Chain A
Amino acid sequence: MYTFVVRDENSSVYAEVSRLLLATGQWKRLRKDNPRFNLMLGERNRLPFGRLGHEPGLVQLVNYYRGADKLCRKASLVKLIKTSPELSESCTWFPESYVIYPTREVFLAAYNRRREGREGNVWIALISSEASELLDFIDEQGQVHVIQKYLEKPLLLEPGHRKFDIRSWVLVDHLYNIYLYREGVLRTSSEPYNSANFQDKTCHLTNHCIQKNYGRYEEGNEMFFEEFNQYLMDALNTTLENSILLQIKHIIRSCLMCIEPAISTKHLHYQSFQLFGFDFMVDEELKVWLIEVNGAPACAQKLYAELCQGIVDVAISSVFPLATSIFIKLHH
């Protein structure tokens, strides 16, 4: 009988993993603060990593990678991409970004040749086109967010000239195998895209909730992979694998192999896995760009069952075995 605890009840993904674990008859749930656990589905902030791996007679495993926040915060992601020699020169897949503070000179250096280059020049935080229209926006927020070149020419779906981003779910196990879930999701804009003015906002960024017209073309603004591949075949005479998926796999592999020395638990007294959510957007040249990396992602409703079973199969039962694969292994 393996034992586990649950310390983030707001987790849609790991609430389902708990029931899957309980329905095995070989996993018993304990109280949050019971230290005698095999597995920890830990909290999101201030996870006590320093308390793991000091229980004699217990192999301990955690659903988070200590240090993975350097990839999952917009500020540190930008800093990691510019400073790491593994990325900076040949980072054609990350949009030019700069870290701003509300209390820069490098940021204006590019926007001043944009001012004397006569090309598109809209950036993003919550968008504007003039530099100081967001500089005032920054100093009143009181926190820190990145400035980021906005993609003026995105790939638009037909019918309806719609914008979209792609969400890929990636599972990294205790051996630092990188498992890409074969099912992604396109989060669409159920509104036609408008380049004229950025004051009308709820058509530019395709948040699954900021679409509070809606569900016109597909349910919940979710287009899954089989149809988008079929659309790419019909419209563009190409496949999702060749036009987009090769770059997505390259970006995921690149980002995770970079921080591998800093977060690996290979010879550590406790072990780590983590489910990530990579957010991409594609321009009209079928070029993939990385938006953000979410360290505590939520799955689409159709895939909660299949993905959470895979988390148990690959990341949990591999360490704690009990009495065809849905993942694509990214080699390294």
Chain B
Amino acid sequence: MEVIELNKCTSGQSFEVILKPPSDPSLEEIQKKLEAAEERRKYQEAELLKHLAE
């Protein structure tokens, strides 16, 4: 059981103990996703306003 890298200070200490060794989307891509979803909302809204007009 090996105790390694012991570092001490006023606040406390730290160490590792070993029992055994080993055996993005861009800004424009985001803007064109939020805007595609907005147009889909606006299409659904226009479809309702056409239905209500009928």
Touch between chains A and B, by CB atoms below 8 Å? no
